[PDB]
């Protein structure tokens, strides 16, 4: 019977727990009592982008900090010029039930997918004037939850089967598959080094993967419920996660443990989406009550609110130059936010 | 004024895209979307197959059928290869016109169907969506209770006290034991529905068989009633 293997697993868990406990010499909260708080942060809606018919499910910024892609469950994929609000392209999808959206770092491609279990790559730059499907990647058994390009030829996906996969695009072949989660993998993000990525799943666990070795490096487990969103800290040494338990948490890859948690007694609804600012000092989180809260990432004080949306905040993202935040909602609008002097 | 020649041309392109979005907005609103749910034992496969015939990929995660009644277009969806856990993907459907819930009335498994319906009805995002409820395989239920070999009160002991409601319509000339059985099973779903509907959404029960052609008319009439209540709400008459 496996009870000996269970006992060995429990013994190993006890060993790991004690090792992590021994490292918890002092908390981040004690150390950051020195620094000045950020003070009140205020941001204004600088643009509203509108034209989607149904709820917006995802968005992603281009690396130029100016082009933006957005997906809605009416089956359009739209590319926006952020400065002018001009629509650059409108792409009709084969399936309405899109759930994820990505912009290639070169801007040559966008990727899309959802309940079809298929990830579709669209070529934006061709000798004809029209966008068309370059490749359809099929082999996941459940819905596509997230996808991110490593480059124009490699893309990483996660799905409702408890699995992530790395694909070639030239051949539609899974080059590697990552297995070990026991629930739906809900979100994914790449390290800046691109050699590593983290995934969060409906098992209240997060895992660190090596894209080259194809194996789980580490597992993090502080949350009490499904992890909906994950994001690397700009240094790449830490990441944040948001859950239906209404908390965010910050983990460091080398202390191997939770540094800090962001929560308040007035907040009792799930977190949909998370991002840092360019310095990492601000953590932005979107909520089912359709505000966004801005957190001092070092002190865990709440420091501001974005409060323009009429319905669930589904996605948000910060430009690579840090100049603006965009938020999308089931109200079917995107709003772009910036501070003021 | 201040725009360059190319900037004016880029704006003209953007306006033609909007002109296209405004066109297919009319197609999107003129079409009603339906989610079809039911366990493996339910006859839902026969419903879509029959309905696909009478009117109008190996890991496909979702399937669709199109049908039309009185020049009104319906798209009906049912999930394919998804896993058994559904608390996440079900949130996509928060904006369909109705959910069609199909039950095998002969597997008194019924408790499993009740717990499923209770979850759909109470969920934070699916509330405000009305449920059309097909109590299917009524022919098998009739034969099963007439054979007397297995007793509903082995599973629902309150059935010893239930008596046929005065609304009961035994129009087929059915045996009254069949009638009492049918309306008991129906009333167990209505017990759940009336406990929390708050007037925002309603359940529409129908007794059905796999061979029955009328199912397309049933869905049409219920969607008419659902949409009529929605208009009465937003015109502030309600």
């Amino acid at each position, epitope marked *: 019977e496996l009870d000996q293997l269970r006992q060995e697993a429990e013994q190993l868990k006890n060993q790991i727990r004690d090792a992590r406990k021994a490292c918890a010499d002092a908390t981040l909260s004690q150390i950051t009592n020195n620094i000045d708080p950020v003070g009140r942060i205020q941001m204004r809606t600088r643009r509203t982008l509108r034209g989607h018919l149904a709820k917006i499910y995802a968005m992603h910024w281009g690396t130029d900090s100016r082009l933006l892609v957005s997906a809605s469950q009416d089956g359009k994929l739209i590319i926006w010029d952020s400065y002018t609000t001009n629509k650059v392209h409108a792409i009709p999808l084969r399936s309405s039930w899109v759930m994820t959206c990505a912009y290639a770092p070169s801007g040559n491609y966008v990727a899309c997918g959802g309940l079809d279990n298929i990830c579709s790559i669209y070529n934006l730059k061709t000798r004809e004037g029209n966008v068309r499907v370059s490749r359809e990647l099929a082999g996941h058994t459940g819905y596509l939850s997230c996808c991110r390009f490593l480059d124009d030829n490699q893309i990483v996906t996660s799905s409702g089967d408890t699995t992530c996969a790395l694909w070639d695009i030239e051949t539609g072949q899974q080059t590697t598959t990552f297995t070990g989660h026991t629930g739906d993998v809900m979100s994914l993000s790449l390290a800046p080094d691109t050699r590593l990525f983290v995934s969060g799943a409906c098992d209240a666990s997060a895992k660190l993967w090596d894209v080259r070795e194809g194996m789980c490096r580490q597992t993090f487990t502080g949350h009490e419920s499904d992890i909906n969103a994950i994001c690397f800290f700009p240094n790449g040494n830490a990441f944040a996660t948001g859950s239906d338990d209404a908390t965010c948490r910050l983990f460091d890859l080398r202390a191997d443990q939770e540094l800090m948690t962001y929560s308040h007694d007035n907040i009792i609804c799930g977190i949909t989406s998370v991002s840092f600012s360019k310095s990492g000092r601000l953590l932005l989180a979107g909520y089912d009550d359709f505000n966004c809260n801005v957190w001092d990432a070092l002190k865990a004080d709440r420091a501001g609110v974005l409060a323009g949306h009429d319905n669930r905040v589904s996605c948000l993202g910060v430009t690579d130059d840090g100049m603006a935040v965009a938020t999308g909602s089931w109200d079917s609008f995107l709003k772009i936010w910036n501070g003021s002097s | 004024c201040t725009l360059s020649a190319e900037d004016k041309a880029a704006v003209e392109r953007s306006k033609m895209i909007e002109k296209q979005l405004q066109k297919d907005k009319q197609v999107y609103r003129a079409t009603h979307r339906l989610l079809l749910l039911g366990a493996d034992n339910s006859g839902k496969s026969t419903i879509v197959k029959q309905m696909r015939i009478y009117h109008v990929v190996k890991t496909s995660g979702i399937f669709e059928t199109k049908f039309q009644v009185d020049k009104v277009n319906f798209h009906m969806f049912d999930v394919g290869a998804q896993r058994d*856990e559904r608390r996440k993907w079900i949130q996509c459907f928060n904006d369909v016109t109705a959910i069609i819930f199909v039950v095998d009335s002969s597997d008194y498994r019924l408790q*499993e169907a009740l717990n499923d319906f209770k979850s759909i009805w109470n969920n*934070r995002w699916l509330r405000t969506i009305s449920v059309i409820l097909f109590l299917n395989k009524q022919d098998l239920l009739a034969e099963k209770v007439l054979a007397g070999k297995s007793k509903i009160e082995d599973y629902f002991p309150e059935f010893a006290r239930y008596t046929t409601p005065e609304d009961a319509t035994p129009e087929p000339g059915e045996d009254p034991r069949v009638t009492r059985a049918k309306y008991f099973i129906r009333d167990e779903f209505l017990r759940i529905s009336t406990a929390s509907g708050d007037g925002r959404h309603y359940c529409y029960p129908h007794f059905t068989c796999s061979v029955d052609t009328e199912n397309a008319r049933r869905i049409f009439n219920d969607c008419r009633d659902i949409i009529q209540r929605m208009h009465l709400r937003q015109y502030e008459l309600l």
Partner: nanobody
Amino acid sequence: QVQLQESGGGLVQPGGSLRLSCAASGFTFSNYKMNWVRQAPGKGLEWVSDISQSGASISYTGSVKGRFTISRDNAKNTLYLQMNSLKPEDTAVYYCARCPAPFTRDCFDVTSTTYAYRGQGTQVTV
């Protein structure tokens, strides 16, 4: 981490009694509705009973409606099932299973084949 561990199961005679106990850790026990689930040897999971956050609302399947009672102790992070007048058909693995999210009326997946927030289970033979 979230973990659940049932105890007090075992052999009992028909007409006998048992108390199952579940100890919960790694979550704010008071915020979640909780359930008992069982698996008879020939079939899948079936739901048995549930209890709301406060212990106010309670429900059962008809097969147990008069015979079992569920209770909870929010001061002690523990859940109980008093079982009386047990029958041979009650032989099963019994599992303690949390609802997925706090502060909510629904719980979809508690009877799924690989749900994450469910205990190891305890055998009961009759």
